[PDB]
Design a protein around this ligand. Structure first.
Ligand SMILES: [Zn+2]
Lengths: 101, 7
């Protein structure tokens, strides 16, 4: 274990970063920050605290924990909070890719 | 430092 932004081991401190965060977006600062993010200050760009994985362009349906497992599959942060099983089912859907054919 | 878009 070795955080990418050790000053964030505290979510409360990640909460503090979402002010310029367009409140209009479906993704609330409580969720994002909780999912290990923090707003970088521009647009809707938030980074992870324990893998520093960057994520922009968010849609009404995009869920923080969710997206944080789909593109940043290797985060020691997500893999420790929500577990591997959670990360699996996130990826294993695609259950739709074998239905489309 | 790039951004790994979600959508
Ligand atoms: Zn991460």
């Amino acid at each position: 274990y070795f955080p990418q932004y050790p000053e964030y081991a505290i979510e409360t401190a990640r909460l503090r970063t979402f002010e310029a965060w367009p409140r209009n977006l479906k993704q609330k600062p409580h969720q994002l920050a909780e999912a290990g993010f923090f707003y970088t200050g521009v647009g809707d760009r938030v980074r992870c605290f324990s893998c520093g994985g960057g994520l922009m362009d968010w849609n009404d349906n995009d869920e923080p924990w969710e997206q944080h497992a789909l593109w940043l599959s290797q985060c020691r942060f997500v893999k420790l909070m929500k577990g591997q099983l959670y990360i699996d089912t996130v990826a294993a859907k695609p259950v739709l890719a074998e239905e489309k054919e | 430092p790039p951004f790994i878009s979600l959508n």
